[PDB]
Paper text:
The proteolytic degradation and inactivation of insulin is believed to be mediated primarily by insulin-degrading enzyme (IDE), a ubiquitously expressed, soluble, secreted zinc-metalloprotease. IDE belongs to a small superfamily of zinc-metalloproteases (clan ME, family M16) that evolved independently of conventional zinc-metalloproteases.
To elucidate the mechanistic basis for these intriguing properties, we solved the co-crystal structure of Ii1 complexed to catalytically inactive, cysteine-free human IDE at 2.6-Å resolution. First, the IDE-inhibitor interaction is restricted to the catalytic zinc and subsites S1' and S2'. Second, the active site of IDE is configured such that the P1' and P2' residues of Ii1 both point away from IDE's internal chamber, thereby inducing a partial turn within the amide backbone of Ii1. This partial turn, which is also present within several full-length IDE substrates, appears to be a structural prerequisite permitting extended peptides to fit within IDE's internal chamber. Finally, and quite significantly, Ii1's hydroxamate moiety, amide backbone, and P2' residue all make substantial interactions not only with residues in the N-terminal portions of IDE involved in zinc-binding and catalysis, but also with multiple residues within distal C-terminal portions of the protease. This finding highlights the fact that IDE's active site is not completely formed unless and until the N- and C-terminal portions of the protease are juxtaposed, which occurs only in the closed conformation and only during a portion of IDE's catalytic cycle. Consequently, Ii1 appears to inhibit IDE not only by active-site blockade but also by the novel mechanism of locking IDE in the closed, inactive conformation. As our co-crystal structure reveals, the potency of Ii1 can be traced to its unique ability to interact simultaneously with both the N- and C-terminal portions of the active site. Finally, and rather unexpectedly for this type of inhibitor, Ii1 proved to be remarkably selective for IDE vis-à-vis a wide range of conventional zinc-metalloproteases and representative members of other protease classes.
Numbering used by the authors: 43 to 970, 979 to 1011
The structure:
């Protein structure tokens, strides 16, 4: 029949738990398509992935295909308004994004389900007739510059591009994918290039139907989705472009047996070991590099990390196969280094080769392959249902690699045992084929090369033949054993029947001095899993900086010592999260419920009978100090957000206070602190999953009883269950706090307009206003004025209080940023005046859909409940209630809200601004074609955070529901 469709796939294998319906197909023009039908979904979604990317940039215009990616959002022939796509998503509860990697350009969106077609029609135009408007091109190249700029001082981006700079310079692998204003405007103008033509050429040459894959997920029937896709995409034109390939490895003989010493921005010590390998992707049914990676990166007893860590050389290890492109891959073993480790690199590498030699000695092990195959089969039977935007984007990228019928399963199911491929990859991991990189500040001033894009200081040297040889002669070492059978592999999957008195919301089913237990048997997803959440309260976790430090150090010591044993639980889908909070501790255990009370008991029992190892303590202390220091290198906006948390919360210790207090933490002081920490606690828990009320009360009591037995824990007093308050700003005040980022050459600013306490009405005024401004703020402060790449607006909530915040990071100074934000607010008040009733109801409706969007997986529903509980507002039915009220609001309500709390001459404006100056600006003059900025008041400049808090009231806390 149908001329537009080349073929329709057979049944797409799915999990028997997956209620979604599926149909793959190839259009006549060669687009591979997956259609997904989910008649329950609140948001629909599409993605498109083009098998072209950075590796195919013209050598003379680096960043082109990334730049192209930005430009597609900026208008098409059919929809020429620059921001028609974004504004349309925004008005319909949607969102979009896109990335560029060396081989792919991947675009995706989601939207309210009622508006799939609308969104999809705008979206399809990207691939048909983008405008590449000339003035948009001139504007947007700044966003790309900014994007690169945020990366320049990031250690992972520096290392990522350094590796490319050290392979064969002629290989496409050495290209600079991001681009910047120099590569995409300046050098091009100099060399007489018309970038608008170059974008049109590149779009035209590579954006061919035969290199595309599309996924669409909506409520529509499979057939309705089919007609929609055929209608919007079969006009994409087939230019029959050959898929790029890269058979020649970027690392040839000259590039092997090399050592690189590199200077980090942060104080971090790492060792990176790499081997070039062939492309293993075609072997996906057997997956030799995953097998080798599971072994070499294992963390249990017998393992490489185990030895390295006992010797006190390393704390963490990553091992396995790394993506390259079509034609080449890499195999990596990477570790972090202790101060001792750094002096023993030759030896750490030797142990790496001994462990590899052990694998050669034992040969391939079917039983290990079996274990990996079983785990993966279980991961797949019971995978959490995904959010549509990521799912589509992810599936779009893999329609390029697997038959239609296998796209769901291809990355999970294992079929073939291949001792031959396993041997073959193992014979590549040899010292003659090795590359070695060491990162340490100790190389400060001893380097002689500079990487062009990032500025990285490094030195390159042949590894001495004597060293290659000592490595080639790696002997067996008896500290290394293959792992043994994994006892945490779950086998019990029954979904307990829903109990007669089971509730829609969690229920308070235990209310004692020691503990408060919220509980909900899962009535939605029906996977054999559960989430067990615990807040442990204790005034001794945050009483001062020394205690905060200790709470941290203790819990890190605890995790380091459970690691070897927890890691099996982790391979088996049972994981845990354990950290110190400003109120005490937080513990979360999630995964397959089968073996979960076993891991829970081991954790509480380790925690309350813990014995510290002097060697591990000194190593972790030093790491903690670096981590505290390394804050100086986070980015300006992160700094701005951080200082604002310090200014506005009643109690908060600074990184400076914590560093200072850390030299005073001693083994004996820590040994004392723990029993003290645990002597009086209150526990608030949410147990949510495949479990009964009786199992839940049981698990809770098991945690209490363990602490009672081993730490003699007694209940805390209700009065000592103290939450911190937010600083209460004065009607008409404006305060400014200013600092310098010493590393990055950009500013950051956070601006907080504080409104009032959270409550149904104040929540929906703020939230509605934020919905209405959200997209325009992006479109004004970034798309048009191009202030920076990071531009953000939205509700701030803390400590029961709220307001509107702006976060921008920019080359322009903060005083200027502030002036444009104020300009924009005026604009928004006129915009709300000029807007139709219906435009207003649309915003209501879009917020409404956002707030009502149902969780698709257990842990998302747990998150919502956990939010109600740690905030102690306990408003589990908040979404229906808040929306009921929203729907009642009017244009006049929001104008009044703005005029009272937000306008520049508002009677109750409460403003605080953090300015973070870039490395090289020296004063900040704190006050200062384009919209007119109002005149601002002289701000009170904050000199001292503590004084500032002393001199202001504190808000009440929010009464519980
Ligand atoms: N609220 C609306 N309407 N805007 C949606 C924001 C999407 C934006 N995405 C992008 O900047 C790029 C993706 C990327 O950088 N690839 O290289 C894609 C893009 C997308 C939408 C466009 C919309 C109009 C004009 C040009 C656009 C170009 C984004 O993710 N920024 C990252 C962010 O969240 N910053 C915080 C940080 N990184 O810490």
């Amino acid at each position: 029949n149908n001329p537009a469709i080349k073929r329709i796939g057979n049944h797409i294998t799915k999990s028997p738990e997956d209620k979604r319906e599926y149909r793959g197909l190839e259009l006549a023009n060669g687009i591979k398509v997956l259609l997904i039908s989910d008649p329950t979904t609140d948001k629909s979604s599409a993605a498109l992935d083009v098998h072209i990317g950075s590796l195919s940039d013209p050598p003379n215009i680096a960043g082109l295909s990334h730049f192209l990616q930005h430009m597609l959002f900026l208008g098409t022939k059919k929809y020429p308004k620059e921001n028609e796509y974004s504004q349309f998503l925004s008005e319909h509860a949607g969102s979009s994004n896109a990335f560029t990697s060396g081989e792919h350009t991947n675009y995706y969106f989601d939207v309210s389900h009622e508006h799939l077609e609308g969104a999809l029609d705008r979206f399809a135009q990207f691939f048909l007739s983008p405008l590449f408007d000339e003035s948009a091109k001139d504007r947007e190249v700044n966003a790309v510059d900014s994007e690169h700029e945020k990366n320049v001082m990031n250690d992972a981006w520096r290392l990522f591009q350094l590796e490319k700079a050290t392979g064969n310079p002629k290989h496409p692998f050495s290209k600079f994918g991001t681009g910047n204003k120099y590569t995409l405007e300046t050098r091009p103008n100099q060399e007489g290039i018309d970038v608008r033509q170059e974008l049109l050429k590149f779009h035209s040459a590579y954006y061919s139907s035969n290199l595309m894959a599309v996924v669409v997920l909506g409520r529509e029937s499979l057939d309705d989705l089919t007609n929609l896709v055929v209608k919007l995409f079969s006009e994409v034109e087939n230019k029959n472009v050959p898929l790029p390939e890269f058979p020649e490895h970027p690392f040839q003989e000259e590039h092997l047996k090399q050592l690189y010493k590199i200077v980090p921005i942060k104080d971090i010590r790492n060792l990176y070991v790499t081997f070039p390998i062939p492309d293993l992707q075609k072997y996906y049914k057997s997956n030799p590099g995953h097998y080798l990676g599971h072994l070499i990166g294992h963390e249990g007893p017998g393992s490489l990390l185990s030895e390295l860590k006992s010797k006190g050389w390393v704390n963490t290890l990553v091992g396995g196969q790394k993506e390259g492109a079509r034609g080449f891959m890499f195999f990596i073993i990477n570790v972090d280094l202790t101060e001792e480790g750094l002096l023993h690199v030759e030896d750490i590498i030797l142990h790496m080769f001994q462990y590899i030699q052990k694998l050669r000695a034992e040969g391939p092990q079917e039983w290990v392959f079996q274990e990996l195959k079983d785990l993966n089969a279980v991961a797949f039977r019971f995978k959490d249902k995904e959010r549509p935007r990521g799912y589509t984007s992810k599936i779009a990228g893999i329609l390029h690699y697997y038959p239609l019928e296998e796209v769901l399963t291809a990355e999970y199911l294992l079929e073939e045992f291949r001792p031959d491929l396993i041997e073959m990859v193992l014979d590549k991991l040899r010292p003659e084929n090795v590359r070695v990189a060491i990162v340490s500040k100790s190389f400060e001033g001893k380097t002689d090369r500079t990487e062009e894009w990032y500025g990285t200081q490094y030195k390159q040297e042949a590894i001495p033949d004597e060293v290659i040889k000592k490595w080639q002669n790696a002997d067996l070492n008896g500290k290394f054993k293959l792992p043994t059978k994994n006892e945490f592999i779950p086998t019990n999957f029954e979904i307990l029947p829903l109990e007669k008195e089971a509730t829609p919301y969690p229920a308070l089913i235990k209310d004692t001095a020691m503990s408060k237990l919220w509980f909900k048997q899962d009535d939605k997803f029906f996977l054999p899993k559960a989430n067990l959440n615990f807040e442990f309260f204790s005034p001794f976790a945050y009483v001062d900086p020394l205690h905060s430090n200790m709470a941290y150090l203790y819990l890190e010591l605890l995790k380091d010592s459970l690691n070897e044993y927890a890691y099996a639980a982790e391979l088996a889908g049972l994981s845990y999260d354990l950290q110190n909070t400003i109120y005490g501790m937080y513990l979360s255990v999630k995964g397959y419920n089968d073996k979960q009370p076993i891991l829970l008991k081991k954790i509480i029992e380790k925690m309350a009978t813990f014995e510290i190892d002097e060697k591990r303590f000194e190593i972790i202390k030093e790491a903690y100090m670096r981590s505290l220091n390394n804050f100086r290198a986070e980015q300006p906006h992160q700094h701005a957000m951080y200082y604002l948390r310090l200014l506005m919360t009643e109690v908060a210790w600074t990184k400076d206070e914590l560093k200072e207090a850390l030299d005073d933490v001693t083994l004996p002081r820590l040994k004392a602190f723990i029993p003290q920490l645990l002597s009086r606690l209150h526990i608030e828990a949410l147990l949510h999953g495949n479990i009964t009320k009786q199992a839940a009360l049981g698990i809770m009591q098991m945690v209490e009883d363990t602490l009672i037995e081993h730490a003699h824990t007694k209940p805390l007093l209700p009065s000592q269950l103290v939450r911190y308050r937010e600083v209460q700003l004065p009607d008409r005040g404006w305060f400014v706090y200013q600092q310098r980022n010493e590393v990055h050459n950009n500013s950051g600013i956070e601006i907080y307009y504080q409104t009032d306490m959270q409550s149904t009405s104040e929540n929906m005024f703020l939230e509605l206003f934020a919905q209405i401004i959200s997209e325009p703020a992006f479109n004004t402060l970034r798309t048009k004025e191009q202030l920076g790449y990071i531009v953000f607006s939205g509700p701030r909530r803390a400590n029961g209080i709220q307001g509107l915040r702006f976060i921008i990071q920019s080359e322009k100074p903060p005083h200027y940023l502030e002036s444009r934000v104020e300009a924009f607010l005026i604009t928004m008040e006129k915009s709300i005046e000029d807007m139709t009733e219906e435009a207003f109801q649309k915003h209501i409706q879009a917020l409404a859909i956002r707030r009502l969007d149902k969780p698709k997986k257990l842990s998302a529903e747990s998150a919502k409940y956990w939010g109600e509980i740690i905030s102690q507002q306990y408003n589990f039915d908040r979404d229906n209630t808040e929306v009921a009220y929203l729907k009642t609001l009017t244009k006049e309500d929001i104008i009044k809200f703005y005029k009272e709390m937000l306008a520049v001459d508002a009677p109750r404006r409460h403003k605080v601004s953090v300015h973070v100056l870039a490395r090289e600006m020296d004063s900040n003059p704190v006050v200062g074609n384009l919209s007119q900025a109002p005149a601002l008041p002289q701000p009170e400049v904050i000199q001292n955070m503590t004084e500032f808090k002393r001199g202001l009231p504190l808000f009440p806390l929010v009464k519980p529901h």
